[PDB]
Amino acid sequence: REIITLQLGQCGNQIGFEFWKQLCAEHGISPEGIVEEFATDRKDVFFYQADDEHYIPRAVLLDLEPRVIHSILNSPYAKLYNPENIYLGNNWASGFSQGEKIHEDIFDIIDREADGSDSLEGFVLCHSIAGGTGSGLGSYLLERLNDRYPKKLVQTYSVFPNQDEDVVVQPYNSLLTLKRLTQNADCVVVLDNTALNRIATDRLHIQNPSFSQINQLVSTIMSASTTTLRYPGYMNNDLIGLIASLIPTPRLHFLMTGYTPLTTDKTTVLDVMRRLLQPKNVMVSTNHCYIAILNIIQGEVDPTQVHKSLQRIRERKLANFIPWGPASIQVALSRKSPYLPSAHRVSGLMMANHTSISSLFERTCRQYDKLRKREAFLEQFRKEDMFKDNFDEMDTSREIVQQLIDEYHAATRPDYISWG
Amino acid sequence: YEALRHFLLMEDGEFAQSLSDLLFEKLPGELLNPLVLNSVLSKALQCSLHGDTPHASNLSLALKYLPEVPDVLSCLELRYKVDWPLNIVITEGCVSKYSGVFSFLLQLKLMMWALKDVCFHLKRTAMAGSVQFRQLQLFKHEMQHFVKVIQGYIANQILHVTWCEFRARLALEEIQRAHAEYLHKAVFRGLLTEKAAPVMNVIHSIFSLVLKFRSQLHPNFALMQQSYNTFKYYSHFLFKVVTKLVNRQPHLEDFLLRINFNNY
């Protein structure tokens, strides 16, 4: 069915706008919005279709004190959207309280596109973790759309703040938002700034204007992850069947992402599979290993070569991973997109459950604990104190993510007959 | 040819995913006359963005026999018909074997319906975690993998590698010979041959236990744990019978992988 996307945060609104620019380049529309007669493709799961010849993308545009949204206005894509949902803090708790006081009218904006379409499948949350304006508010609406509708699917697009230590309040914020993503979202697509910055410094020569480049990298990822849904495949071409294969344990819903062209600014399948398994073509940063991998192909692919290629990785002993179930590596095939200039014809995807990211989590679980011993880096905001007078909800969230780390460490081994 | 590929062999998205999903809601004591689903057919092609063609007409979806009636039955036949000067090439015997493989793939579709039902049935009870919920959900994830195994086998043989041929074979008797070889390889790659009949016989025993897992909601847990154990029992026997039939095939070589990765 149809999928509604919601973007908040300034960085989130930017990457949502660039994503819709990428899809306007993808789909049979002009940059004004008007249909082009050159075109197979479906424009229904992400675009509301009138006959106003300007098919409006199904995006909910919310903000706090619009600054970059003015720059979103000065563009030729100002005729692509106008659903009139633009409305005028610093912490998780302050942003949570500010989202608390105005919940009725933003939820009326949600109920508007809920009543606008008749079929409903999923909500994509475009959000940055511990981002200030995004944090608190995004966790609040995440709690509310899961509590209000238990029949739909919740997916999130999320980057990870990592700068190798400055914001001293970030481990509290990420800790609480990770609790809310684990208990109020069914699947989370995890990215970080650091690995994409590393790959960007690898391909280009960039130090200062990194943001403008990594946005392009992210948008290529999010378009690629939706090519199997927008163009009709037969495997996991709905969101529900896609997420139903990727979760072996209901606490594990974090998906690793890669992309086989590391630079785009002939091939057989075993080549791109082996290039795919390398950690440098991976976009997300003791024995730590995958539980189950799904890889998705896009290009001119002969069908018998994929069988030989999977046989090749079986013979390589590149499978030095060992979970406790026979749920295995997964191949899928979709077409490369027509209708646009398409360089580097065959390109790959991976969607995998990897426990190396738990190290990333425990770094936050390290940092907050140190600040919890010092008690000088909570910054003592007034709404933060009124919202929780004892600050034991952060301690309870630390307990939940500690159980999450123990369940990860049990999921690494082939011994999960007992709970971890 | 590329129309029957989208119709009976079901290389059309939101056409299979709209037909079988609508049809299995009803069932039987209903759906006994072919005057509603034969018009649901015309509604499903509009949802697939492939319809309004001349191939969209001369279709017929009807029951070949009214049943006397857990149920796995399938006797519903999709047919595509062609006019007189093309009937001499696309004979009346090839369309019957096309419907014969259609019933098999339709029986594959009920699996992805019922497994999705237990997936949603366990989704609705998710508050706080408990041991009883996770240890039951893993059987569903486990069964799901074996269907993505058999589907990945079919998505290599019948729809795809015999689709490389019959694309470089169609370059007046030659066209009829090409069409006959495409269908004859489609049934041989469909595991309906008497050589791979012990491989086919265990797949029904897999299907039956999944539907028995579907009907159920310790609440009933040991009765379902036994069903999952019978499942892994039958699959470990399948791993031996596929090896015996490559020791005494090029198309069967694809199978003994897919059932087993990175494991003995």
UniProtKB/Swiss-Prot annotation, chain A:
Gene Ontology, cellular component aspect: apical part of cell; cell leading edge; centriole; centrosome; ciliary basal body; condensed nuclear chromosome; cytoplasm; cytoplasmic microtubule
Q: Does the keyword Ribosomal protein apply?
A: no
A single Gene Ontology biological process assigned to it is: meiotic spindle organization
What GO molecular-function term can you cite, just one? microtubule nucleator activity
Q: Which UniProt keywords apply?
A: Cytoplasm, Cytoskeleton, Disease variant, GTP-binding, Lissencephaly, Microtubule, Nucleotide-binding, Phosphoprotein
Phosphoserine modification sites are S119
Q: Which domain of life is it from?
A: Eukaryota
- Record function comment: Tubulin is the major constituent of microtubules, protein filaments consisting of alpha- and beta-tubulin heterodimers. Gamma-tubulin is a key component of the gamma-tubulin ring complex (gTuRC) which mediates microtubule nucleation. The gTuRC regulates the minus-end nucleation of alpha-beta tubulin heterodimers that grow into microtubule protafilaments, a critical step in centrosome duplication and spindle formation.
Quaternary structure, per UniProt, is: Component of the gamma-tubulin ring complex (gTuRC) consisting of TUBGCP2, TUBGCP3, TUBGCP4, TUBGCP5 and TUBGCP6 and gamma-tubulin TUBG1 or TUBG2. TUBGCP2, TUBGCP3, TUBGCP4, TUBGCP5 and TUBGCP6 assemble in a 5:5:2:1:1 stoichiometry; each is associated with a gamma-tubulin, thereby arranging 14 gamma-tubulins in a helical manner. Gamma-tubulin at the first position is blocked by TUBGCP3 at the last position, allowing 13 protafilaments to grow into a microtubule.
- Name listed for the protein in its UniProt record: Tubulin gamma-1 chain
Look up and give the organism this protein is from: Homo sapiens
**What broad taxonomic lineage does this protein's source fall under?**
Eukaryota, Metazoa, Chordata, Craniata, Vertebrata
UniProtKB/Swiss-Prot annotation, chain B:
What's this chain's function?
A: Component of the gamma-tubulin ring complex (gTuRC) which mediates microtubule nucleation. The gTuRC regulates the minus-end nucleation of alpha-beta tubulin heterodimers that grow into microtubule protafilaments, a critical step in centrosome duplication and spindle formation.
**Complexes and interactors:** Component of the gamma-tubulin ring complex (gTuRC) consisting of TUBGCP2, TUBGCP3, TUBGCP4, TUBGCP5 and TUBGCP6 and gamma-tubulin TUBG1 or TUBG2. TUBGCP2, TUBGCP3, TUBGCP4, TUBGCP5 and TUBGCP6 assemble in a 5:5:2:1:1 stoichiometry; each is associated with a gamma-tubulin, thereby arranging 14 gamma-tubulins in a helical manner. Gamma-tubulin at the first position is blocked by TUBGCP3 at the last position, allowing 13 protafilaments to grow into a microtubule.
Q: What family does the entry list?
A: Belongs to the TUBGCP family.
Q: Quick one: which gene encodes this? A: TUBGCP6
What is this protein's record name? Gamma-tubulin complex component 6
Disease note: Microcephaly and chorioretinopathy, autosomal recessive, 1: A syndrome characterized by microcephaly, cognitive impairment, underdeveloped retina and choroid, and epilepsy in some patients. The more anterior parts of the retina, near the periphery and pars plana, have a grayish hue and diminutive vasculature similar to retinopathy of prematurity. Visual impairment becomes evident during the first year of life.
The entry's localization annotation reads: Cytoplasm, Cytoskeleton, Microtubule organizing center, Centrosome
